Amino acid sequence: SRLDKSKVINSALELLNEVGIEGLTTRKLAQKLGVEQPTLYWHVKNKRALLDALAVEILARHHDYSLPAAGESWQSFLRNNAMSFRRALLRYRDGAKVHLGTRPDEKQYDTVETQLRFMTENGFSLRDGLYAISWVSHFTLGAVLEQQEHLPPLLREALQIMDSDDGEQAFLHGLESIIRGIEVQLTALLQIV
Template sequence: MTSDRPARLNRDDVLRAALELLNEVGIDALSTRKLAERLGVQSPTLYWHFKSKAALLDAMSAAVMQESRAIATPGPDEAWQDWLMEDGRSFRHALLAYRDGARLHAGTRPGEAQRGSIELRLQRLCAAGFEPGPATLLMMSVGRFVVGWVLEEQSAQAVDAPPSSTLDGPDASQYPLLAAGWLANVRGDADAVFDRALRLLIDGARP
């Protein structure tokens, strides 16, 4: 029995081309038509691998996480605060690795491939004294914090960023506290500011 499925184009080829196209045109301009043109095929060919654009975007998000995010099991003697900080940093770097990475990931849920790693993290949090509910909520809070943080970063860097994203800081003579905070955080080193903000969230969590 013969199959009409294209022999040369596999799922990884489609994902790789889609991520390259994402970096070039952004998530709003990404379309299955443009992707098919890049691959030299007709649009219906892509449906052998992905039934819709939404399914393609979902798979692209998972591929970004697998490719760019360091997935490490916490060591038995490692403080949960430390590995959760590192996990948040790794997540941010993965989202920043691609144009519109935060928008691509927003709203997705972990698939089967990610659930084993999540279960190990929850085991470590529960061993530290958390119940499953609060442990899961803590990991969700860190994840959503990172997505929101990177969404702000990438939106401010976009070509069509709001004009207010480039405004100067407040007048120190009129708003001394706000000016000091602005200088330390809005105009500070991006990685260091992120670390301080994430640390505030994690330090507030207690079993």
């Protein structure tokens, strides 16, 4: 019964699950809400507008480990934040693609600012703090994108165990390798690593 912003977005998230980022259009959203296209256009001007809103909501509803806890170590922060970002992305169909295809908004910007601050307080230079957060974000995006898209002897036998896993243990193992890489770099300081 409503074209209130929260209900447009809830309905569009529902639709995104039904049809994916490609098949989602303002025309189908209007059909879904019981409304004429010019009525919807008043509210949501185009698909780019829609997807910007959806990206924000995806991270607003499900990315609850965005900020580091009091006393938390940097390692645990990156681990927990990566884990939270991944699950937020996997909640909706093409969620990674919705995230990729929009520019950062006010929240993300404010949130990454608090994260750099946190990192810098923990030994990281600005560039390395930023690189760390970005590299973790890129690794996580790649993994989810591959999962949401988703025979030689050795590949056969190694695939035994990717089988029994949509991608989480592989994601978790690689995440530790990265964090340990960052610990070693960080600890070496201004000498040869």
